[PDB]
């Protein structure tokens, strides 16, 4: 629907500017001239700027000749120090070309956005090639991951090829008939979930970005991917359920919960996600529920939080020492979020925290340790270590209680 609603008249000012500026007979700007402007030894951003700015005025029908030069040279736009307006206008022109010339534009655009270290890199990514394996479009040069216009382009491509692949393999299984439908549905669900996971991993800050600065290209790409995932979840919430059952790196949970308004449906299946055997899935469920409770503080959210507290208290006395550490290290920062969402949980949260603190203290007492936290019973506050698991878990319990008390007190 994005391409169709793009065609919709907004105000008609574009027609006015068409009739006014294009009448200058500056239409001497030709694809060969644009290609020459791109291939200057210096960057020479002025000439390409003027040409593509002029091309914005061109109607979609006559803009077809410029498809080859714009797509072929968009790899050069990844270089450092390219002006933003160049990429913005390229995005606008690509959207226009997509509105009138979708399929071959997609084929040539994917062929153009190859990593380029492999040079040709199998330029035979035909229409069928992408239609069978939509994830090819994600196999692109790393620089697009922090280039918001071309990233938006790639997201459009990815959505289109997911739907195209669905219809394609449906048609293929129909014609090859001469059960398999279950395998079709499973393959489609797996493909959509895999696309979602790759996008989420793109949203992660890399090590260099890890090496504050909340306004950058990464935030723009995160917003774009969040919008696309919102569209996908609206299209099929079962994909959201499958992705969350698969889980993903918990650093994204604030980002994903804040940027995907359809995420509120997660409270429906979180009770069933909790009941999975895998410890990792339960940990992820607790973290997800904590972020949602921060976001949406609803009675159903409170009931699911009560269930979360009860299961954490339950399997506190089912897990071994190593399992206790591995489970309660990530899910303890969720308790402060639960306290923030729901004051009526203070009783159960504090009772659970006391029980786990005494269990961990006894566990510390069983074996000789380095720090011996029990004798350090009168320590002060310490805001922000390869020690043994139990003292780490005790310090984590301490920090959880510190955060809860500090936020409630102020």
């Amino acid at each position: 629907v994005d391409d169709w609603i793009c065609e919709e008249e907004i105000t008609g000012t574009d027609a006015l500017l068409r009739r006014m500026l294009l009448t200058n007979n500056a239409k001497n700007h030709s694809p060969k001239q644009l290609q020459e402007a791109f291939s200057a030894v210096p960057v020479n951003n002025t000439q390409v700027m003027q040409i593509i700015e002029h091309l914005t005025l061109l109607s979609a029908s006559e803009l077809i000749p410029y498809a080859e030069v714009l797509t072929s040279n968009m790899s050069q736009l990844l270089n450092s120090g390219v002006p933003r307006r160049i990429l913005q206008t390229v995005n606008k022109l690509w959207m226009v070309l997509n509105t009138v010339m979708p399929r071959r534009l997609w084929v040539m655009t994917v062929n153009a956005l190859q990593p380029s270290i492999k040079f040709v890199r199998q330029q035979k990514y035909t229409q069928n090639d992408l239609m069978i394996d939509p994830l090819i479009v994600l196999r692109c040069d790393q620089r697009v991951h922090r280039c918001p216009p071309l990233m938006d382009i790639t997201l459009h491509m990815l959505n289109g090829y997911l739907l195209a692949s669905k219809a394609y393999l449906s048609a293929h299984l129909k014609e090859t008939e001469q059960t398999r439908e279950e395998l079709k549905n499973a393959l489609l669900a797996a493909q959509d979930s895999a696309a979602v996971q790759i996008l989420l991993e793109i949203c992660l800050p890399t090590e260099e970005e890890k090496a504050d600065n909340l306004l950058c290209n990464l935030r723009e790409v995160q917003c774009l991917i969040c919008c696309l995932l919102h569209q996908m979840y609206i299209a099929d919430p079962n994909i959201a359920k499958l992705v969350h059952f698969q889980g993903y790196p918990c650093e994204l949970l604030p980002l994903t919960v804040a940027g995907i308004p359809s995420m509120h449906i997660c409270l429906d299946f979180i009770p069933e996600l909790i009941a999975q055997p895998e410890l990792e899935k339960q940990i992820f469920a607790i973290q997800l529920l904590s972020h949602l409770c921060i976001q949406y503080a609803l009675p159903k959210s409170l009931s699911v939080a009560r269930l979360a507290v009860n299961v954490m208290g339950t399997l506190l006395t089912v897990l071994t020492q190593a399992k206790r550490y591995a489970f309660f290290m990530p899910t303890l920062p969720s308790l402060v979020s639960f306290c923030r969402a729901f004051p009526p949980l203070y009783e159960d949260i504090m009772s659970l925290l006391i029980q786990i603190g005494q269990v961990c203290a006894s566990d510390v007492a069983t074996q000789t340790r380095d720090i011996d936290p029990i004798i350090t019973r009168l320590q002060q506050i310490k805001e922000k270590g390869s020690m043994d698991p139990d003292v780490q878990l005790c310090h984590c319990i301490e920090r959880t209680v510190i955060e809860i008390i500090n936020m409630s007190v102020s």
């Binding site: 979840y233 919430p237 308004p261 359809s262 509120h264 609803l298």
Partner: peptide, 13 residues
């Protein structure tokens, strides 16, 4: 109902 936030008005028919 993923298209409507839980704190949005409910369209009662």
């Amino acid at each position: 109902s993923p298209s409507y936030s839980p704190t949005s008005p409910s369209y009662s028919p």
